[PDB]
Amino acid sequence: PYVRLGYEGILNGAHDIDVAGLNGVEQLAGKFATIGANGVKLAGDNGTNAVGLFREDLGDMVNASEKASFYFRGGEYYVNISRTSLTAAGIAAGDEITCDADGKMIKFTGTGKALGVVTHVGEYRAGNMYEKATQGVTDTDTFIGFIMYV
Amino acid sequence: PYVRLGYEGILNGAHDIDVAGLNGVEQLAGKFATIGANGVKLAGDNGTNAVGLFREDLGDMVNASEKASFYFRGGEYYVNISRTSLTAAGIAAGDEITCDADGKMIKFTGTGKALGVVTHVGEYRAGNMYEKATQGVTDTDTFIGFIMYV
Amino acid sequence: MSQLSNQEKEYLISKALETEEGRVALAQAMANPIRVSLDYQGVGRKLLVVDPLPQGALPVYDKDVDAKAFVISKRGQVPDQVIEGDRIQVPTFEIVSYPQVRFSQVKERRFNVIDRAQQRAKADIMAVEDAEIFSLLEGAATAVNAVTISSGGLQRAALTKAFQEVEKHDLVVTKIVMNASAFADIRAWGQNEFDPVTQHEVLQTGLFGHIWTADILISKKVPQNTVYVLADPEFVGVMPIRQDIQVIPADKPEELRLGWVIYEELGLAVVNSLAIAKIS
Amino acid sequence: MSQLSNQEKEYLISKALETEEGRVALAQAMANPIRVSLDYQGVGRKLLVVDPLPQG
Amino acid sequence: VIDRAQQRAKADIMAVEDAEIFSLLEGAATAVNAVTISSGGLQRAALTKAFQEVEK
């Protein structure tokens, strides 16, 4: 949700990652969510959000997918439970967060499909809808952002 | 009234006053606009965006919110009827204007917290609410739009 | 000569003309002359920053498999901002008052220089507000030392934290109200017991400087070494502009005083900056 | 981003692109130069550590 | 170097490493501890227990 503030203006205002309660299958080993840099002391919406897929850092931190392009890794088996509040900039748990799903809804922007690359900025984008592909069941084409199912 | 043609910060799309008065099936007492002169197909498009507060000056001219000393331009519940025309293309506030004491919707919040005034731009930018004329109303709006009524 | 009443026709107009009729100016209430300045051109600044690190990694043997360590970073983009104000004045009022012209320009100028610093360093992150520094900086807390103790006591306690970083401090960046009370040393003697006892105020405590700024949040104090830690890029310097020839002066004779800057702020190493919040 | 986007409406920035300026980094104090350091060439070092000493 | 220094000072040894400042050391008798404030006095007091061990 927030593809309606998105369409190339992603990571402004409140965005969740969820429109429906996540599927089963707990993840074992707890860990924190933060999207900040040496602590989240970010309070209020806009700025860097923890929307997008995630990546494990030191395996003690999870954060948003903000790597380099090329050797990109597609789908992942969970998204973090929303702690999006106005005492935060997106999801960032100040306790340990434990995740779940078979994979769930995520947010994709760009002129790709459901899969892009990373420019070290939250979420994925990139062009080429014939060198990229839908994640999840059935073909879905991207034109203004949509919630793509892993 | 049209809401959600605004931009980030506390702002609402343009308000056409068709509700609670509508000149074209009645004619009352005209008087001059000492803001606005810009806009096509009836100017008034940068005289006011969503109808602030209109207050008579010297002689019979009315104008928008301006000043913070030596006769506050603006205030009272005497509002300028913008009639039915075109939304953000036919706002009347740069022409000779007929006012009443009745009308909706009346916007009175500028961008960010504080009772807004009107500059040279028709749209609203942010005053004070205790060092500027207050009409008995305080803005309880949070960032990003949401209706205000005088 | 002699008036008999508080009522005067004389009041409306100038009866004497001098360039001094009263005025104020502050140097200490702005964080921008304190830091170093350099120009930059570009609509924005791009930095790469380090993410959270748990820290630790002990040594292991050469008959046991070598330990590793990693760093994580997120990339950030900072857009430019414009801070500006206009103040609207009636020519008659202005001409007769006289020093009012100078004063209104200097105040609006000061007010813009405060508002640029206020957003960049502090504020919160909203839909019309930024906050660069405040987010990045590392935690430090007076509360560990004691919860409820004097304003003096906090400032002394605060100096020590900086050492940890390998600054060995420089100066403390405090809020104007807070600085006034600490200097005063209130605890309900209002005697000095955390500042030198022969003075009623001080400008060095621990042999380090105090910078008092009103562009910083209330009941917040920040130790950092301002010159290395941040730098101020200037797209445009602050300047007042004056226009008597626009829409509103045309309709009714009016004079506008214009005051503006276009700013950006650079962070060279902002995870050396410590923020502490006062309790008392 | 890192705080509200005011004008940038490009999120790509050419697969990353940044200009020459300071990159933030951690500096911490240490308990390592407190202890004395000296070099050694060998394959292992042997120490003696004191066990219980009977003053009886 | 920072992470090493952090681990090395505090806490009891692991099974891949030996010598950590915290392990090596002894406590102090009840005397060093006071019930009247004097930060200087505690640290001073500590030095004298340490002297018996023959610390310079």
Side-chain angles (χ1 to χ4, degrees):
Chain A
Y2 53 49
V3 284
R4 318 304 193 180
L5 300 177
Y7 170 176
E8 78 181 288
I10 49 167
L11 313 182
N12 274 358
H15 305 338
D16 291 11
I17 203 154
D18 305 314
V19 71
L22 299 108
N23 308 133
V25 198
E26 295 182 319
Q27 301 326 98
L28 318 177
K31 69 311 177 176
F32 311 80
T34 38
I35 185 47
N38 295 98
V40 167
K41 300 160 183 68
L42 295 64
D45 73 353
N46 285 262
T48 183
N49 285 274
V51 284
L53 292 166
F54 305 76
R55 45 175 194 77
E56 287 185 27
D57 303 1
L58 307 305
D60 313 325
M61 311 296 162
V62 100
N63 72 331
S65 301
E66 295 182 303
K67 54 181 188 288
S69 55
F70 185 39
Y71 299 96
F72 64 98
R73 306 304 177 192
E76 139 176 304
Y77 199 69
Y78 51 102
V79 297
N80 285 3
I81 326 303
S82 295
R83 295 294 178 244
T84 319
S85 50
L86 192 70
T87 59
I91 317 186
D95 74 347
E96 287 181 90
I97 173 163
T98 317
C99 297
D100 76 339
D102 288 9
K104 201 58 198 184
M105 301 302 163
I106 61 176
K107 302 168 89 263
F108 183 72
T109 56
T111 56
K113 289 310 306 301
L115 177 50
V117 300
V118 211
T119 64
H120 301 99
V121 182
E123 306 177 39
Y124 302 73
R125 83 293 296 146
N128 306 349
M129 303 190 62
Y130 51 92
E131 294 192 292
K132 299 286 187 293
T134 331
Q135 315 309 116
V137 286
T138 45
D139 186 3
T140 306
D141 296 333
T142 324
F143 292 126
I144 189 47
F146 293 98
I147 36 173
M148 316 291 188
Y149 183 56
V150 170
Chain B
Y2 295 75
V3 189
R4 79 183 300 125
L5 313 173
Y7 297 128
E8 292 190 358
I10 308 184
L11 175 70
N12 296 152
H15 286 342
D16 280 354
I17 322 301
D18 302 335
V19 169
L22 184 39
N23 310 106
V25 290
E26 89 172 7
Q27 299 302 325
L28 297 160
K31 57 260 322 287
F32 288 94
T34 333
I35 195 147
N38 292 288
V40 294
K41 292 176 169 180
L42 309 172
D45 316 336
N46 297 99
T48 196
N49 183 85
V51 176
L53 304 176
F54 273 85
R55 199 71 300 291
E56 300 177 297
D57 318 320
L58 185 70
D60 291 274
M61 59 195 193
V62 282
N63 56 353
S65 300
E66 302 170 11
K67 295 196 194 187
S69 290
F70 312 113
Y71 307 108
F72 186 100
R73 304 301 166 183
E76 296 192 17
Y77 298 88
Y78 183 73
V79 283
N80 168 14
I81 308 304
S82 295
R83 308 76 168 184
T84 313
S85 179
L86 317 174
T87 311
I91 315 309
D95 301 345
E96 200 181 315
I97 36 169
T98 292
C99 290
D100 288 339
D102 307 318
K104 312 188 67 165
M105 262 289 170
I106 316 296
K107 184 51 159 177
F108 198 5
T109 323
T111 46
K113 303 294 299 110
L115 285 175
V117 301
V118 175
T119 43
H120 278 49
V121 189
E123 312 162 51
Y124 303 75
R125 308 289 142 188
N128 300 108
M129 47 272 168
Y130 69 114
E131 311 195 64
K132 309 267 205 316
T134 301
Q135 296 327 307
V137 81
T138 30
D139 42 346
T140 38
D141 303 350
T142 61
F143 317 91
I144 311 143
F146 182 78
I147 73 296
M148 147 65 49
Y149 187 49
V150 200
Chain C
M1 192 66 62
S2 311
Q3 198 53 265
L4 307 170
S5 64
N6 294 329
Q7 290 346 98
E8 303 181 287
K9 310 315 295 187
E10 304 181 51
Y11 172 94
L12 192 55
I13 51 145
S14 58
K15 299 301 304 309
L17 290 177
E18 180 167 301
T19 41
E20 287 318 313
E21 295 180 22
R23 62 185 49 192
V24 266
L26 306 179
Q28 296 307 102
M30 294 178 279
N32 309 246
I34 312 295
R35 289 173 294 207
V36 292
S37 299
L38 67 90
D39 274 8
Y40 186 93
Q41 304 306 326
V43 290
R45 305 304 292 268
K46 315 289 167 233
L47 287 155
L48 179 80
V49 300
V50 293
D51 285 333
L53 307 167
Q55 317 195 245
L58 52 106
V60 299
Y61 299 139
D62 293 0
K63 64 187 252 195
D64 279 320
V65 180
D66 44 30
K68 299 295 175 173
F70 199 171
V71 158
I72 320 284
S73 289
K74 54 180 309 303
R75 191 169 75 132
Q77 297 69 270
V78 183
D80 67 346
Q81 69 193 160
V82 171
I83 290 297
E84 69 188 81
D86 66 5
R87 296 294 179 284
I88 177 159
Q89 305 299 295
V90 181
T92 52
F93 169 70
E94 290 298 302
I95 285 161
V96 297
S97 302
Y98 188 37
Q100 177 62 349
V101 182
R102 276 57 73 84
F103 175 109
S104 55
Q105 282 271 234
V106 158
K107 284 285 180 154
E108 88 200 56
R109 187 286 306 153
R110 179 170 300 103
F111 295 131
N112 293 311
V113 177
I114 272 169
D115 292 357
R116 47 165 172 148
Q118 172 43 232
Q119 283 286 219
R120 284 288 181 197
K122 310 305 301 191
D124 303 341
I125 302 180
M126 301 293 183
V128 293
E129 299 184 79
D130 300 338
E132 189 181 355
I133 307 321
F134 166 54
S135 300
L136 297 175
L137 47 71
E138 313 184 71
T142 32
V144 194
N145 305 158
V147 170
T148 311
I149 179 50
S150 181
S151 300
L154 283 153
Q155 291 322 301
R156 273 293 302 191
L159 309 183
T160 321
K161 302 287 190 43
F163 291 179
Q164 177 44 40
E165 298 295 322
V166 191
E167 293 176 305
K168 303 298 176 287
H169 196 259
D170 186 33
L171 39 83
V172 58
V173 171
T174 174
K175 173 62 167 178
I176 62 147
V177 191
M178 299 302 141
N179 175 84
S181 327
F183 280 170
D185 206 330
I186 312 300
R187 43 183 280 143
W189 298 124
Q191 287 278 118
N192 294 250
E193 291 200 317
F194 296 95
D195 288 358
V197 307
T198 47
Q199 313 308 113
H200 64 278
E201 51 182 65
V202 74
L203 289 176
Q204 295 166 247
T205 314
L207 297 145
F208 297 100
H210 289 258
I211 297 303
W212 45 269
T213 41
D215 58 33
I216 302 298
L217 275 162
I218 189 61
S219 299
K220 309 278 186 71
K221 52 175 175 308
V222 175
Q224 62 183 305
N225 161 23
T226 36
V227 300
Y228 185 79
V229 168
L230 313 166
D232 301 1
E234 284 285 54
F235 187 79
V236 187
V238 69
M239 57 179 76
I241 305 295
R242 177 174 158 163
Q243 283 309 293
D244 309 342
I245 37 159
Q246 287 305 306
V247 191
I248 295 293
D251 304 339
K252 36 182 178 317
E254 284 293 291
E255 291 188 314
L256 315 171
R257 299 303 180 289
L258 303 176
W260 38 273
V261 66
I262 306 191
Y263 191 60
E264 296 189 278
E265 192 157 281
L266 178 60
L268 290 169
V270 185
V271 296
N272 305 141
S273 186
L274 310 173
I276 328 192
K278 306 183 67 202
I279 294 307
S280 284
Chain D
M1 298 313 304
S2 180
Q3 56 298 114
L4 175 66
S5 178
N6 312 356
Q7 310 277 313
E8 296 179 64
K9 296 297 175 242
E10 301 299 277
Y11 288 78
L12 294 84
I13 321 286
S14 58
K15 305 294 190 66
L17 172 59
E18 297 199 90
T19 57
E20 297 181 297
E21 77 200 273
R23 306 299 179 180
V24 318
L26 321 182
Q28 305 295 353
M30 289 173 307
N32 177 271
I34 326 190
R35 302 171 290 248
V36 63
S37 308
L38 56 120
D39 297 342
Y40 181 57
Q41 296 305 301
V43 73
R45 199 78 289 274
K46 297 288 199 297
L47 72 166
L48 293 174
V49 289
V50 85
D51 291 357
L53 41 139
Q55 313 283 255
Chain E
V1 184
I2 290 166
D3 289 344
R4 182 166 73 255
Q6 277 171 297
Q7 295 299 112
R8 279 304 184 166
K10 45 187 171 50
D12 287 15
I13 62 174
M14 303 316 300
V16 279
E17 79 172 305
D18 289 299
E20 285 193 300
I21 294 197
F22 197 60
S23 182
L24 310 193
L25 56 78
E26 302 202 84
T30 45
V32 174
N33 166 242
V35 293
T36 48
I37 56 152
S38 184
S39 302
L42 312 187
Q43 192 52 286
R44 170 64 76 257
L47 299 151
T48 303
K49 300 282 183 181
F51 195 52
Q52 299 327 112
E53 311 163 316
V54 299
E55 303 297 302
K56 301 188 304 160

